[PDB]
Design a protein around this motif. Structure first.
Motif, PDB file in Angstrom:
ATOM      1  N   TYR A  41       2.693  -3.485   8.645  1.00 30.87           N
ATOM      2  CA  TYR A  41       3.936  -2.712   8.807  1.00 30.87           C
ATOM      3  C   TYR A  41       3.950  -1.436   7.965  1.00 30.87           C
ATOM      4  N   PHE A  42       4.695  -0.437   8.442  1.00 27.20           N
ATOM      5  CA  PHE A  42       4.837   0.861   7.771  1.00 27.20           C
ATOM      6  C   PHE A  42       6.304   1.249   7.635  1.00 27.20           C
ATOM      7  N   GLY A  43       6.635   1.918   6.534  1.00 29.39           N
ATOM      8  CA  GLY A  43       7.957   2.514   6.356  1.00 29.39           C
ATOM      9  C   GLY A  43       8.104   3.775   7.191  1.00 29.39           C
ATOM     10  N   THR A  44       9.334   4.271   7.291  1.00 21.80           N
ATOM     11  CA  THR A  44       9.630   5.493   8.055  1.00 21.80           C
ATOM     12  C   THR A  44       9.021   6.760   7.425  1.00 21.80           C
ATOM     13  N   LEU A  83       3.821   7.517   2.925  1.00 23.01           N
ATOM     14  CA  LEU A  83       4.139   6.323   3.700  1.00 23.01           C
ATOM     15  C   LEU A  83       3.896   5.074   2.870  1.00 23.01           C
ATOM     16  N   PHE A 136       0.819  -1.215   0.000  1.00 16.74           N
ATOM     17  CA  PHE A 136       0.000   0.000   0.000  1.00 16.74           C
ATOM     18  C   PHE A 136       0.853   1.265   0.000  1.00 16.74           C
ATOM     19  N   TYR A 174       0.301   5.148   1.368  1.00 23.10           N
ATOM     20  CA  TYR A 174      -0.492   6.103   2.146  1.00 23.10           C
ATOM     21  C   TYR A 174       0.059   7.519   1.982  1.00 23.10           C
ATOM     22  N   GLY A 177       7.563   7.963  10.913  1.00 19.83           N
ATOM     23  CA  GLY A 177       6.483   7.042  10.534  1.00 19.83           C
ATOM     24  C   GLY A 177       5.804   6.386  11.734  1.00 19.83           C
ATOM     25  N   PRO A 178       4.674   5.677  11.505  1.00 21.03           N
ATOM     26  CA  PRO A 178       3.995   5.010  12.620  1.00 21.03           C
ATOM     27  C   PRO A 178       4.773   3.799  13.154  1.00 21.03           C
ATOM     28  N   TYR A 193      -0.704   2.132  17.054  1.00 19.15           N
ATOM     29  CA  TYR A 193       0.586   2.753  16.708  1.00 19.15           C
ATOM     30  C   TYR A 193       0.827   4.007  17.537  1.00 19.15           C
TER      31      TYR A 193
END
Lengths: 100, 9, 197, 275, 244
Positions: free
Chosen positions: C97-100, C85, C31, C33, E42-43, E35
């Motif tokens: 999970y998410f990137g920085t 994101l 994804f 964002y 980021g989260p 989160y």
């Protein structure tokens, strides 16, 4: 909605011999639904300490359970397996035959 | 090992 | 999920390129964002099949062999200025999970620069005053190291939608001083032809 | 040679008597290794084998979370299926599920499967290619349209080929002494007279593993598989299995008949005879 | 409901007290994630649930943090004995309606600020500065400037209102505020905004401009011993009519 009548087999773990440690088994199988009552009898009346296996089933979705208990067989004592189920008009008893 | 499953019928 | 190091600056109408790699090769759904300043993250696109996926001006690309995803913003407007994101999940029921995140800022093309430092009166009391530095092109940028008493803010891109007219503005004031409004923005390299009334 | 891992799940509604009963069990070949029961006190995936117990706390916490997620999902499936088939709230109904993978002698992926059942009959099943479904009726196609949209087959295929096989390989090495063994059947014959004319010859086969076994009868060379009283291959209780095949014979013609036995542990197939 | 809904939006808390962050997800969503997001990052993952059961607790920073989701819908993250370093933007999100894989739908978030002393909390003083004489002659446009000053913590929502209706066209607000005393850690903040319109629109005395600033400070249950007014959640406005 389908129902299957249980197939009962009463037998000992090892070859039976008088005055020896052994396990009596009752293998109900090929039944549906899963809800079923099983007791191991000793000269008519039931045994209290009776463990059973975990509920599983075969390729046609029919259930199987192994009820068992430790026992000491003799000449005079007769053992059997009483099984009640929704498919049966009354509880079916199956006597333990030593060579079956 | 089980697969993580939440998918409903 | 390691993402590219921000920030990133792109001209208006230019192609912006955002990338993101990931370790777990068993990740199924990916994804992109978008998070505006002081808002929640909202979804731009989702992708699971390899190769490109177009949605208007945005074009995502997944390469699961080389294990990266990327977003391509074509003809980028100022409204695209956000922190983008990247996000992935191993599957439904697993962690998400998410990137920085990469901080994108699309530099607005001010086609008619008219730099000027104006003075403004407070409607409550005449004594209180503030200096507005506005209508300057994006090549200029401000600085605040003047004094303890003097405060100076950063740039602000306003967008008059009806008239179609961008305008970078900046604000500066002192609490109590003999404050020179002409010499308020004398720290930063302001334009040579700035209007002082 | 060939091996397999399989998980079996059962979910039974008990309207107005708490939540539905949920039982899950895991097998490698014919040896059970794990279980979960919703009525049990522990509320955890428990071990039912010696070789699995060496797994650390991370394995058991992980399996408990996953099996709890199964339990709660199949609880909803009961409610969903009741609405699909338009049945009353008070009636009890069953949901059964099976999935797992097979491997050959080389321990590579042979095939996979994933199947559902409602009230005994087949509901929906993943085909052998692992990219398409088989819908039994109107209701199963409703689930098929949802699962084709959600790309569930692609998710299941990755497990069944990838993860399922890797864990199966790892369990086979962990329980080498249990799973990769091959106990031969201890056979014997027994005679019982039914009448003056008749007589029964039973051919036993005790304490063997795995449960795959063949017990046929022959009347001097040729097969006579009709008039042969077979029974289900039954569990002894200690890991090994039992089976027998009986035949009715005229009195004084017992040594004409022979019992052929075939099994993995047997190098050559045994031929028995009455004394 | 329709979308994900957290509460509270903003929260001030004394150092050492407990807090409970609520998250009401979308109806029928199986998964629910938590989160925290630090300033300009980021989260960071904290924990999540499938149906009722909390999955992996590893992401929770220490044993003071804890979370439940008892009836399989509304979750509640609970921090005990708060410290200044716990201050963050705590977001939750739900996904997977009926178990099928979807995106993560985010809530509006909870701005938690853990303050050492409640006496350091101040509401904003707002003031509208009218357009310049030179700007109307030179550019034929009029720029109002609002200036919310001397507030703590950074809990503010500025908005412009023309004739009793909010406007977003011609508006610009700073992405972050300025520290009034940058040396200090517990420094007050200051925010600026600009509303630009045509010269004709400003010069008309009919039009009524207003800079509204929502501040979030202390709740009704927070104790207050000091002589000045209790710095609670409040709207502080400032206005200026047209003139020619």
């Amino acid at each position: 909605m389908i129902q299957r009548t249980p197939k009962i087999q009463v037998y000992s773990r090892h070859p039976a011999e008088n005055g020896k440690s052994n396990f009596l088994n009752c293998y109900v199988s090929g039944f549906h639904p899963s809800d079923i009552e099983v007791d191991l009898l000793k000269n008519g009346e039931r045994i209290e300490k009776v463990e059973h296996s975990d509920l599983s089933f075969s390729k046609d979705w029919s259930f199987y359970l192994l009820y068992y208990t430790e026992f000491t067989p003799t000449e005079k004592d007769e053992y059997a397996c009483r099984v009640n189920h929704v498919t049966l008009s009354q509880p079916k008893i199956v006597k333990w035959d030593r060579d079956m | 090992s089980l697969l993580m499953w939440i998918t409903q019928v | 999920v390691e993402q590219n190091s921000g920030p990133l600056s792109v001209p208006e109408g230019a192609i912006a390129s955002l990338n993101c790699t990931y370790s777990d090769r068993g990740s199924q759904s990916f994804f992109w964002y978008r998070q505006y300043s002081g808002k929640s993250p909202e979804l731009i696109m989702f992708i699971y099949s390899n190769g490109d996926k177009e949605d208007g001006r945005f074009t995502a690309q997944l390469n699961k062999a080389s294990q990266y995803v990327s977003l391509l913003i074509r003809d980028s407007q100022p409204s695209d200025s956000a922190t983008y994101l990247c996000a992935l999940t191993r599957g439904p029921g697993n962690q998400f999970y998410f990137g920085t995140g990469t901080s994108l800022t699309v530099i607005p093309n001010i086609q008619n620069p008219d730099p000027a430092v104006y003075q403004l009166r407070d409607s409550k009391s005449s004594d209180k005053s503030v200096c507005l530095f506005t209508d300057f092109d994006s090549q200029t940028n401000v600085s605040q190291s003047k004094d303890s008493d003097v405060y100076i803010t950063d740039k602000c891109v306003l967008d008059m939608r009806s008239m179609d007219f961008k305008s970078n503005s900046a604000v500066a004031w002192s609490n109590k001083s003999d404050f020179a409004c002409a010499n308020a923005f004398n720290n930063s390299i302001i334009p040579e032809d700035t209007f002082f009334p | 040679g060939s091996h397999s891992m399989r998980y079996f799940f059962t979910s039974v509604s008990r309207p107005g008597r708490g939540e539905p009963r949920f039982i899950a069990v895991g097998y490698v070949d014919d040896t059970q290794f794990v279980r979960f029961d919703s009525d049990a006190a522990s509320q955890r995936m428990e071990p039912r084998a010696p070789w699995i117990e060496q797994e650390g706390p991370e394995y058991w916490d992980g399996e408990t979370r996953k099996v709890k997620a199964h339990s709660q999902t199949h609880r909803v499936d009961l409610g969903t299926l009741r609405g699909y088939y338009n049945q009353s709230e008070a009636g009890s109904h069953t949901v059964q599920r099976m999935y797992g993978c097979d491997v050959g002698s080389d321990w590579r992926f042979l095939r996979g499967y994933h199947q559902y059942a409602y009230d005994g009959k087949d509901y929906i099943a993943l085909k052998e290619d692992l990219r398409s479904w088989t819908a039994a009726d109107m209701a199963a196609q409703t689930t098929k349209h949802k699962w084709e949209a959600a790309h569930v087959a692609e998710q299941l295929r990755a497990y069944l080929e990838g993860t399922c096989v890797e864990w199966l390989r790892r369990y086979l090495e962990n329980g080498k002494e249990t799973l990769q063994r091959t106990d031969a059947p201890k056979t014997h014959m027994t005679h019982h007279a039914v009448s003056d004319h008749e007589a029964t010859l039973r051919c036993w086969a005790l304490s063997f593993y795995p449960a795959e076994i063949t017990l046929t009868w022959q009347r001097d060379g040729e097969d006579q598989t009709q008039d042969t009283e077979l029974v289900e291959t039954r569990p002894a209780g200690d890991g090994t299995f039992q089976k027998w095949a009986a035949v009715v014979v005229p009195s004084g013609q017992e040594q004409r008949y022979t019992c052929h036995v075939q099994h993995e542990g047997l190098p050559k197939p045994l031929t028995l005879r009455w004394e | 409901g329709a979308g994900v809904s957290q509460s509270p939006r903003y929260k001030v808390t004394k150092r050492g007290q407990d807090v409970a962050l609520r998250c009401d997800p979308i109806s029928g969503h199986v998964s629910l994630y938590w989160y925290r997001q630090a300033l300009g990052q980021g989260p960071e993952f904290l924990t999540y649930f499938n149906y009722e059961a909390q999955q992996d607790k590893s992401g929770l920073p220490n044993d003071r943090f804890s979370a439940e989701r008892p009836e399989g819908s509304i979750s509640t993250l609970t921090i005990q004995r708060t410290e200044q370093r716990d201050s963050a933007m705590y977001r939750c999100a739900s996904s997977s309606p009926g178990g099928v894989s979807t995106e993560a739908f985010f809530g509006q978030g909870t701005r938690l600020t853990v303050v050492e002393d409640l006496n350091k909390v101040f509401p904003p003083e707002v003031a509208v500065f009218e357009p310049s004489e030179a700007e109307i002659s030179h550019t034929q446009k009029a720029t109002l400037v609002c200036l919310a000053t001397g507030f703590y913590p950074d809990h503010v929502e500025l908005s412009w209102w023309v004739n009793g209706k909010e406007v977003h066209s011609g508006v610009c607000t700073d992405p972050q505020p300025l520290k009034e005393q940058p040396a200090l850690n517990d420094s007050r903040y200051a925010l600026s905004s600009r509303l630009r319109v045509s010269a004709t629109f400003w010069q008309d005395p009919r039009n009524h401009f207003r800079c509204q600033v929502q501040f979030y400070g202390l709740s009704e249950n927070d104790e207050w011993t000091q002589d000045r007014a209790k710095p609670v959640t409040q709207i502080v406005s400032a206005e200026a009519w047209g003139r020619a």
